[PDB]
Amino acid sequence: MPHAFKPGDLVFAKMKGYPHWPARIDDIADGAVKPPPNKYPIFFFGTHETAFLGPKDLFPYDKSKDKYGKPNKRKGFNEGLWEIQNNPHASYS
Numbered sequence: 001m002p003h004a005f006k007p008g009d010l011v012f013a014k015m016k017g018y019p020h021w022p023a024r025i026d027d028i029a030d031g032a033v034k035p036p037p038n039k040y041p042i043f044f045f046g047t048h049e050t051a052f053l054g055p056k057d058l059f060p061y062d063k064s065k066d067k068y069g070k071p072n073k074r075k076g077f078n079e080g081l082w083e084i085q086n087n088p089h090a091s092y093s
Contacts, residue, residue: 010061020068022084046080
């Protein structure tokens with residue numbers, strides 16, 4: 001049965017106006033900006049941008065990849081599909 005989201009979990013993350021996007025729950029490093037309550041730091045593969053999102057916008061990768069894991073014309077999308085499948089836990093800093 002599901003647990004709560006934790007750093008390292010792989011997801012498709014949804015934001016207004018964008019397709020469901022390959023992403024991971026990031027850790028928060030000492031000294032880094034913390035998310036708002038009930039929000040998670042989302043790192044988006046491909047773009048390498050961060051946003052804070054709640055669970056309503058977070059779809060677990062294994063369950064969702066058939067549906068959402070298909071090429072997209074949006075900038076960085078296809079690079080992001082490679083990263084989530086091939087090296088989802090690397091430093092992209």
